[PDB]
Amino acid sequence: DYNGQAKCMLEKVGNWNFDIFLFDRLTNGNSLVSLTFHLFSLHGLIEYFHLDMMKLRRFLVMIQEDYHSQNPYHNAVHAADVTQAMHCYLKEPKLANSVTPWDILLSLIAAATHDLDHPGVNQPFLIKTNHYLATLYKNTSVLENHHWRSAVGLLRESGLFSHLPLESRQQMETQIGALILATDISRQNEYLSLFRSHLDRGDLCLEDTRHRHLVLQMALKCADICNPCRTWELSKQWSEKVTEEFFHQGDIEKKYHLGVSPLCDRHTESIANIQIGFMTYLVEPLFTEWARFSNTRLSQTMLGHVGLNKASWKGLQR
Ligand SMILES: CSc1nc2ccccc2c(=O)n1-c1c(F)cccc1F
Ligand SMILES: [Mg+2]
Ligand SMILES: [Zn+2]
């Protein structure tokens, strides 16, 4: 019964108002696997790369279960959402008309795994608590590097692409890594500035692999923080979950005298002030530039929701 209603939702998987929460409820927490598997079929990746469907399900399942379902925000549901948003961007004219099956393949996988095995606390927390991951990656894109090497781990263990040449598997790993590392919010000014320069010069050539992947990296960055770009009802749920996770890190910091990180203090920081600032300083600048690149209706819609949703947070004050 429930698994019959899920199929129908996937018919509108390219819709910006797709309800990922419902989809995950109907599938019993199998949204990432169910949605990503469908996208592989939909983009014809199974045939294109002679994929063993048994190996594909195993791989997708290893990914989904490697997410901590206990994190209120960084879990497989969040991954599924980013993956779904990525799919809508790939449908945009300028990308649809230049990406190769291979690009779509790396895009979807990178989206599905960009927060793999996320611990639920940020980088500065891992650094000041001397977490081995911070040591391993020399306090640089600690989380993103961890998500990527984990992805490379599941890629190898699944043997999904064992029939492809080594060189190809290695490139797949390198390009997925470049896509995942671009999601390190900490380095957005560098990524946004570069993108902006190119949009000003108007020199981007989409038939060039490098330029095309810079764009794909910006699309992944968008997908990762497009929560405020969704309809209020969806955006509201994400705002509460990300804030809940932030506050939990804060409670731990307070309890163990580690110093309460910014945005993580439930006593001195409002969920509204957090969302407003986030939308004003990180979401809006990014999507404006993206709108300069992909000047379509989806871009207007997305910036539109950010406008409405933000006012609603201000409204929810005084
Ligand atoms: C809602 S996610 C988020 N909110 C912020 C609010 C103020 C300052 C910084 C952030 C921020 O870095 N994030 C964020 C992100 F944009 C991407 C990944 C994780 C995050 F915590
Ligand atoms: Mg991340
Ligand atoms: Zn993310």
Task: Give a written overview of the molecule.
With 318 residues, the protein is mainly α. It has a single domain (1-318), classed as 3'5'-cyclic nucleotide phosphodiesterase, catalytic domain (Catalytic domain of cyclic nucleotide phosphodiesterase 4b2b), CATH 1.10.1300.10. It has 17 helices and no strands. The chain has helices at residues 2-9, 20-26, 31-42, 45-48, 53-65, 76-90, 93-96, 101-113, 123-128, 132-136, 142-158, 166-181, 188-201, 209-224, 232-255, 271-293, 297-315. Helix 8 (101-113) runs parallel beside helix 14. It is globular and about 55 Å long.
Query: Helix count?
Result: 17
CATH fold title:
Catalytic domain of cyclic nucleotide phosphodiesterase 4b2b
Ligand inventory: 3-(2,6-difluorophenyl)-2-(methylthio)quinazolin-4(3H)-one, magnesium ion, zinc ion
SSE order: HHHHHHHHHHHHHHHHH
CATH superfamily: 3'5'-cyclic nucleotide phosphodiesterase, catalytic domain
| Rg (C-alpha, Å) | 19 Å
Share of helix among residues? Answer: 55-70%
Organism: Homo sapiens
Binding site for a divalent metal cation 2: 115
Enzyme class: hydrolase
Catalytic activity: 3',5'-cyclic AMP + H2O = AMP + H(+)
